[model samples]
Target: LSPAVQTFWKWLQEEGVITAKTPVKASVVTEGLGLVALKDISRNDVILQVPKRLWINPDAVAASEIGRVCSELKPWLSVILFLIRERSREDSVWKHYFGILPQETDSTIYWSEEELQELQGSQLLKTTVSVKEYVKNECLKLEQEIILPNKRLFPDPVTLDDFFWAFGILRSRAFSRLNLVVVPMADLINHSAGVTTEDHAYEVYLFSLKSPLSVKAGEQVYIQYDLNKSNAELALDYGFIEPNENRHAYTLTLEISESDPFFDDKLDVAESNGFAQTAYFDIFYNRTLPPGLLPYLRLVALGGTDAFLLESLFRDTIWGHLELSVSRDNEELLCKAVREACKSALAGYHTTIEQDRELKEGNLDSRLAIAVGIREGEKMVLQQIDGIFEQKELELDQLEYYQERRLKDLGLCGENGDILENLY
Candidate 1:
């Protein structure tokens, strides 16, 4: 292992972020259907920790460099596979990493001669240099500001593909672009989104990013591969969209490139042409370091509601959250209600939990209804919620907010345990 990678892995283990059945030498995501737990557990249980070491931009152009990096990190082939595969989706124009082939149903995707040529020769293929320029220029044009402090770590004018690939692989869904670093000796916990990424959620090979949290043995480490996609096709195919709710769910629909020519389904993704479609909701997770741009972003949301529906959803959710309040009517009851609500919401929130087997045969209405019900419940929950605003409250405020989310879905009494956990 490279010294840095070794250090990152050691740090992850030492930090109690991850725990392997045996002493894992390097990262080993479950192969075939990447490794998953044999059993179930409660919320906040530690699954595993993934340590971030060297990051190579998938949009980075250079087969030689890819080979070089892969050669060095052969142990973490899944990571390499994830990076290459993901990059292929962003810039089908650059497919050397995917060996210049369309992803296949079998074990791997295949590439054609012309495809291989493009992958091999294209600068934008691994074109980190080109992407950086694109980001700088585009950000200037879009006037987008990434307000993340720690300027040293967060610089401007970086490509959405680079940022997406870098962060996407870490925590597939709902990962903070902030704090990319992981401590030593942590379990590289993979999220359910990994399954969605590889399977039905828009052909993106998503993964979980790193976070700072200690985990213990026998704990189910969880990462937020939150199922929040905006694509009509993806939302439907992956069972991400609810049957009864409005089509748009997430606040931000991040798109790094135009749809992959090779992948028909993702053709219309918001950031298909190399931009991260920021939704109003993204602000909650994202600091939006530079503020004046809010109007423009909101305007963008207004103009492209369908296009930016995910982001709108994100932003709207955040906005509505301002109204959230919980009473300690033994608020833990409300908390549990909110938790159940979110649990139900999340149950319906899968990007593609209803796999190929279910997709063809699943009760579309039932699935959609779950998603719809979750949102309907959320709206109701937000309305009934009374107390100090959620974000404003400081310590353990999550209990209040989460409860609100649940109460919104499950109802005030918290009688309905119709969440996925109950189904199982």
Candidate 2:
């Protein structure tokens, strides 16, 4: 451990931020420094507590020199500004805490252009671009609105890089309190899907959660950051994929062209049915598509003659059979639509899934490895969808042949079910 971290441990022990009864100890783990159990801990037990005074939040900074204009800024941004200011102060109580913070991060915010290109086909790449742009604008606002105006009060000049660094640290670490706050010792717990809970406490503490499962001695502890977030979300916020099958989802966005004859009608109907003009869909790890996705695609594939069908389909009920079998014309239309959609989505990737896998397996930079994992995961989702549509197409062909044979055997119609033969 670094000297600062050692000091932080000593300070926590001395100040009673973490007491002996907590049953957890900070230690270096494979991923990074994480909290580990010193002894067996039961479910629903309080794993750790950060006293109210140890919580670093906007409220804490509200009484500082920057507090006057802090309220005008967004809560998270205000906290970022507060962190930067406090870290630079010689007299700051949080000096040890700041020292222990990871001076660098593997989050996409810090990725180089070449490193970012490794995630070309993933939604996270787009999101990373958007976040960078947003942060760039926020940096400019902070400089003009606060830093430049109070240059004398600031201990040192707050550059854009300084703001970016602080923002990245908060982006990757800070948890939401009443507002965003950094809880000493508590923030060191890494994330897992279902092992922990965010049960609120009414005592002197600001925030806490409980364990949902027991931990044996020497086991590393994890907290659930969110149970509802998808793999895309996990990768974006936490810089890692949730390896469990149940917790991951692949996202797809449906775009409609304006040139279609029924574009306006589709727009109105989609809106009336609570879908945006451009809809978003998720293909979950359970191998299920969104309930509305097929019906929406079915609507888009309809001809002008079939326009009247929209009202019935858009009514307040489930639209179509959720399965992928091509039993109905709507089902066949849905199958074709999904196949095309999957093909189109796959085309966006610059590298094949196998290529990404190779990259992931080899020794590569941390940012590049994360990028490969995200792209490869998304490709798996595309391949699964593609395979479903292909099987459905074959099933439809077989079903048609069997129906024709059955009709012939019944003597109701000859081959092709000719109208003359049926009339006879």
Candidate 3:
């Protein structure tokens, strides 16, 4: 730690901001600077305490001269501007805090045009571009409306780069509490899915979980930025993605148009069951299909069937409860639809999974590495879905055979044993 960072830590201890009872200290970890346990801690122990006075928010910014002028700006933008102003000041009390912050960030915003191209077909690429434009526009507006009008008060003009840097810091570090606030040492915790992040909903502050887990001496503490977010989301929001197979993140969109013959019927059935005409399926880590995906496919496949029989099926049972034989043909259609959708989503990406893996093996740029990780993770999901579909045909065939035998045994089918063909 630098002298300034050391001073900051000492200040926290002296001011009772973080008492002796707080058994954590900020230090370098596998994932960067995270909180490490100084001694063994029992469950429900207070990891660290951030005094209210140390919290940086819009209300704190409003106390400053430039902040008062930029009051109309949103919390994120205004507070980031506050950080820039504070950082430029030689006598600022928070200089230690500024010194400890990373001079450069790995977030996609900092990625060069070429680096961004690695994520050619990603939704995040578009978002990153939009964010860049937004920052540029906001800086121009601020320069003309705020800084230019009062140049002397703000002797040093803030540039777009400065705004971007501050925004990056805020985006990755700050937490929301009616407004964005930077909580000193409390922000040093790392993130894990079902661990620290899962308890965020029940607690207000990141460190104030309902029941904090026990940590062995020298163990690192963590705070989940988002519990339900996928690797794609973590990369977008936090500039890094975890290497885990359990993330529920693959998003596939299925489209239905008015030109199709069954459009009206499919639309009616879907809308009645609270499904959208254009369905979005999220293939989870466990490979369980989204609840509405198959049901909507079933509706679309029912186009050639008898209206009265369809009505009877709808009224008699929920879409999912219908026997596999009832929608055997439709089930095959659903399987095919899912297979094609996965293939299409995978095709959108420019790089192959093997290429992504090779890039990951090399010492690539931080932004490029993150993009590769995200794309590779997505490819894994696609390939898994594809592999599952390869077996789906056989699975369905067996289901059909089993259902036929059961129907015959129950005397529900005729001697020909071709009941499923007529049932649909």
Candidate 4:
């Protein structure tokens, strides 16, 4: 059975967050406690108008005595400490609502080494480790700034384990009002991806044309989170993946190797193109790579004659073509480098793609499946990239190069719009 949400409903009424009985109520969902329609809410009805007064934020935290002293704390930590302080009190107003929040933080921050192993080839594995260290370091700061300084308030020695829960809680639960506040009953709705930029703006305006489009009496009401955020982000922040239609992506970071003869020129070109020396691009599972990724790869792979283009007056033109394609040799170099990276990435996975595919056929829990699901998503993106460049190189070599196109352009040998080789 679903928990405390019904009682929490009464509490919302008491707080005046519910001026009247709303159609939505908390219920058990595959994604944990999500809001469901108690009765049919009209398609255009403003489902809940959770006022600004009840929002829990750093603003609320900073108002208290502990909050005043912990002034140096980060916004997130401020709220984290606030939740911890409130949870410490039997008399705290938010206790009932807090109790309804999920205790098991499913984000990779808390995953065991064994669980981490499941994400072997995924970038999230490294990211998980990276964030764990970051969170651990933040806790140390909390120890110095808040926990140690205020002992009577914190009778318990609020360790990394304690702070990390709230860390994970805020990441998974809170929405960005820029002020970073948690709306009362609004937090109960589950996430629905691929809905829109339109849906996001809709939630920003609560009590207007609220609730998701055309939710029925028995339907699980969902709020749009982000449309294009990959399964990795979904798994990281939200701790779940949408199995049917997940946008799996790989973050491909490329740099002009320092040893390259054209490193300076490459950096100049990259700067001119509004990119850093080392840049990150998202390569999606489908043929949906970021437009800049291919160009960036081609830039990094530029060499010999290709490097000359970076010095030419038409440097922008060369860079622009790199967005789509490059010279035959340049294309070859870019394709080779990308293939190696993808293969290198694939090799890091403890289990092969085959292993993950086989594992999914078995009856794994949602947690285990999420790990495998995310792993497969990333691997698929890599494989897709390898193939895209594979075909790209194949076609480029068979077609023609800039010189041939240039000749063809000047009415010389082959391509259209030609003048002739004599013009040169």
Top-scoring candidate (lDDT): 4
TM per model?
A: 0.24, 0.80, 0.73, 0.87
Tens-digit per-residue lDDT, 1-424, candidate 2: 6687788888888777677777887788866788888899787677777776877777777877788878688877888888888888877877788877876677777778888888776777888889889988988888788878888666488877788788877877777634467787777887766554654332344446455568899898777777777666766676666556555567777755587777877676677667877888888655676777765776666555455544555344223321222134655776887888788888998999778767767786666767777777777878888897789777766543222433656754446756677899
List lDDT for all candidates, in order: 0.32, 0.72, 0.71, 0.75
Q: Stretches of candidate 3 above 4 Å error?
A: 13-15, 19-22, 62-72, 91-93, 122-127, 130-155, 176-179, 192-197, 200-213, 216-219, 255-272, 275-279, 298-337, 348-351, 354-369, 390-424
lDDT of 1 by residue, 1-424 (tens): 2454455445445544445532223433431112234344333333333333323332222243333333433232223333433453544422322231112311001123333232222111233234334534543332133223223323343444443343333332222333232222222344443232222111112223322223343333334333453323222222232332232222322222333232222222223422243433321111222232222222232222122223434443433332243233323332344344434444442233334225435443433333333334333333232222232234444445424565566545755667867889
lDDT tens digits by residue: candidate 4, 161-272 = 6787788778877776344767767777777763443353234534222665667789877777767677888888877777743478788888877798888878888888
User: Per-residue lDDT for 1-424 in model 3, tens only?
Assistant: 6586677788777767678677877787767777888898766666766655676788878887776687788776778777888898978767677878887677888877888888887766777788889888977887787778877656797887888888888888887634477877676677755365344322344335322566789887665676667777677667787767665367777655787676765566666677778877777566676766655555655546423334545554434433343446766776787788778878899989889888878898667778888788777877788788779767876664224644666764448656766887
- Candidate ordering by lDDT (highest first): 4, 2, 3, 1
Between candidates 3 and 4, name the one with more favorable TM-score. Answer: 4
Clashes of 3: 0
Residue ranges of candidate 4 with Cα displaced over 4 Å: 1-3, 177-179, 193-209, 321-326, 352-355, 409-424
Model 3, residue 320: distance off in Å is 6.6
Among all windows of ten consecutive residues in candidate 2, which has the lowest summed lDDT?
317-326
- Output the lDDT of residue 208, model 2: 60
Q: Which ten residues in a row have the lowest lDDT in candidate 1?
A: 100-109
1 or 4: which has the higher lDDT?
4
